[PDB]
């Protein structure tokens, strides 16, 4: 009804909406990295270049 | 973390000449530098300092030249004075170094 806007439809076949299967649950894959980078020895320097 | 070597290990030349000596890092130190200069039974004295910037008192014959890894100490005339040993300096970044000046460089004058 919504579709036609109208509270009367005619006896027939009507394409209403889509559907589509939710995701169920979410997944992350990244290389077995485990060093930190280092943003320590650059940023926390005592002394930066001219 | 911050090695250097100091070439040539000597350098000897007659008074007319230039002298030169050449102070390289393994990486790059930026303009942090300082040279010093030790006579015989006397502590070294500062000379060049932030590799450019000539010392208080010191004579307009030495010049600190280079950025980053390579720095050049050039005389413009020696007058048989200034023969001793001279080091270079990192002032960079000492927290593990095993010694914050690098080689000894003797120069002898023959007049």
């Known amino acids: ?50 | 973390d911050i090695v250097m070597t100091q070439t040539p290990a000597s350098v000897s030349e007659p008074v007319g000449g230039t002298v030169t000596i050449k102070c390289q890092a393994s990486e790059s130190i930026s303009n942090w530098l300082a040279w010093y200069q030790q006579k015989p039974g006397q502590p070294p004295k500062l000379l060049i300092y932030a590799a450019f910037t000539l010392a208080s008192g010191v004579p307009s014959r030495f010049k600190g030249s280079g950025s980053g890894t390579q720095f050049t100490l050039t005389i413009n005339g020696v007058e048989c004075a200034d023969a001793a040993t001279y080091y270079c300096q990192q002032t960079y970044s000492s927290r593990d170094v095993d010694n914050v000046f690098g080689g000894g460089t003797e120069v002898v004058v023959k007049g």
């Open chain 1, 1 to 50: 009804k919504c579709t036609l806007k109208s509270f009367t439809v005619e006896k027939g076949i009507y394409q209403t909406s889509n559907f589509r299967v939710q995701p169920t649950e979410s997944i992350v894959r990244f290389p077995n990295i485990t060093n930190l980078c280092p943003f320590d020895e650059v940023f926390n320097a005592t002394r930066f270049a001219s």
